[PDB]
């Protein structure tokens, strides 16, 4: 030992928080802070659960390498959702590997040759609503994401033929991942016999696809799955096999729809509220007014890069309301911060929602100021802003959720007036993608196309 951080109470034998914990998440790991300030433990059927809020506090999580911290143990309902061997079921040489061709896949040089598919699709889908209107911003950006991410991801063969048969696999994976799965990934629910033949459909569906490309060689592709059909392990010439390809387009696929789609809504929603729109809604269409004298009509990354206005507002819906809660490592070699001593064992935690809610790092956090990231982003101090994580493993669609909520919101203030219906929703902490409550809604009222 050394000095163990403060055990949270809680008088129920054996479960301790458990009841208190599941059923207001934010709310209990919140009130856990305030009465036992930066890092504390929880029990729950004797598992100890560290907690880290703050920048001082997130050090020895996002610095500390694979050896010294795991993924495995708490990402494991990942396993039979993404398939055998992939990602967070990987060995470490064969998992980082996959992570190295995840990169390649979404890259600078990628995303570039990505943006005119992700502006089509935008402008396609916004065309066809009318001159008037309402809906729910939530579901149409959760159907826009899926649809293009259906091309960027798997391609243009699954986007033209089998993009509604994808759509509903997809949805089948979703619905096999209850509370009860992060607990028990393999409990014999009818849910997850659904979700594991579903997955093994998607497995089918996708051989019929890389075998067609390697019996026409030449023709090239532009998507991520081309990118894992000529990723390569190193030493083997054995390359990748069908099963894996599918685990990882799986595990992408999921991506964007648990998280760009929450926060890809959240922007919209915030800028186009009343006092938000008084204030930081002029300074972004000045700013697509100047993008447009430089560069035209069109949306290209390089278009997009400049936006730095919006870029913000998209930015400090992530600083609000967070699509993750929480992120997760079992600890290998025990370590120190302050006075206090992690033992090898315990899960700890970190809290993108709660950490960037912390007054003495961001000034006024239950306010709504894009352009409190214009003074943050000089600030020396690593891991204040935590959304995308950090480290060796650090977010690393990024780019690509900015560019797509960018691409979908440039698409909107240019073509849209747009009004918040009714007051602003509250978010779903206790739901399995943490989003806006429905109803969701904007009312639209067309400008001149
Ligand atoms: C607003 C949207 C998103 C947020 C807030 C977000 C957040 C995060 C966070 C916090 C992590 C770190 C997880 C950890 O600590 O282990 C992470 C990891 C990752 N994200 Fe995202 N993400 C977003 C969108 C995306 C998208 C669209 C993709 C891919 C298409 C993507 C791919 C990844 C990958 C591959 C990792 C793994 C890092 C690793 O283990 O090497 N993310 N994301
Ligand atoms: Cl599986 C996981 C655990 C913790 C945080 C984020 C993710 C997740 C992911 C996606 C692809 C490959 C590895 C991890 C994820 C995958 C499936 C369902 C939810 C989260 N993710 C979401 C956004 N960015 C990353």
């Known amino acids: 030992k050394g000095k163990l951080p403060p055990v949270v109470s809680s008088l129920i034998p054996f479960v301790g928080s458990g009841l208190s914990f599941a059923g207001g998440p934010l709310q209990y790991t919140t009130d856990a802070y305030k009465k036992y300030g930066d890092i504390f433990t929880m029990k729950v059927f004797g598992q100890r659960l560290t907690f880290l809020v703050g920048p001082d506090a997130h050090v020895p999580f996002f610095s500390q390498g694979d050896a010294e911290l795991s993924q495995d143990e708490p990402y494991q309902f990942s396993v039979p959702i993404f398939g055998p061997n992939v990602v967070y079921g990987a060995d470490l040489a064969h998992r980082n590997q996959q992570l190295k061709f995840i990169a390649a896949s979404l890259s600078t040089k990628a995303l570039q040759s990505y943006v005119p598919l992700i502006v089509k699709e935008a402008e396609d889908f916004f065309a066809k609503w009318d001159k008037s209107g309402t809906v729910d911003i939530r579901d149409a950006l959760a159907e826009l994401i899926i649809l293009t991410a259906s091309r960027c991801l798997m391609g243009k063969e699954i986007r033209e033929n089998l993009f509604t048969e994808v759509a509903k696999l997809y949805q089948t994976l979703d619905e096999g991942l209850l509370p009860i799965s992060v607990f028990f990934p393999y409990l014999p629910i009818p849910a997850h016999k659904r979700r594991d033949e579903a997955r093994l459909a998607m497995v089918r569906m996708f051989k019929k696809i890389i075998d067609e490309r390697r019996a026409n060689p030449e023709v090239k592709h532009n998507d991520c799955l081309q990118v894992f059909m000529d990723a390569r392990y190193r030493g083997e010439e054995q390359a990748l096999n069908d099963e894996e390809i599918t685990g990882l387009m799986i595990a992408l696929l999921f991506a964007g729809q648990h998280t760009s789609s929450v926060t890809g809504s959240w922007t ?7 006092n938000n729109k008084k204030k930081f809604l002029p300074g972004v269409l000045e700013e697509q007014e100047e993008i447009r004298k430089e560069f035209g009509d069109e949306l290209t990354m390089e278009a997009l890069n400049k936006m730095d206005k919006l870029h913000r507002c998209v930015k400090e819906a992530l600083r609000m309301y967070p699509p993750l809660l929480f992120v997760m490592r079992k600890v290998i070699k025990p370590f120190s911060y302050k006075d206090y001593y992690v033992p090898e064992g315990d899960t700890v935690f970190v809290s993108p929602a709660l950490s960037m809610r912390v007054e003495e790092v961001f000034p006024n956090a239950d306010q709504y100021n894009p352009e409190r990231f214009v003074e943050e982003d000089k600030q020396a101090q690593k891991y204040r802003f935590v959304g995308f ?61």
């Open 389 to 449: 994580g950090a480290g060796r493993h650090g977010c690393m669609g990024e780019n690509f959720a900015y560019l797509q909520i960018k691409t979908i919101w440039s698409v909107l203030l240019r073509n849209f007036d747009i009004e918040l219906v009714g007051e602003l929703p509250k978010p779903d902490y206790t739901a399995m993608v943490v989003g806006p409550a429905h109803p969701c809604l904007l009312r639209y009222t067309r400008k001149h196309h």
């Open 268 to 274: 919209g929603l915030l800028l186009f509220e009343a």
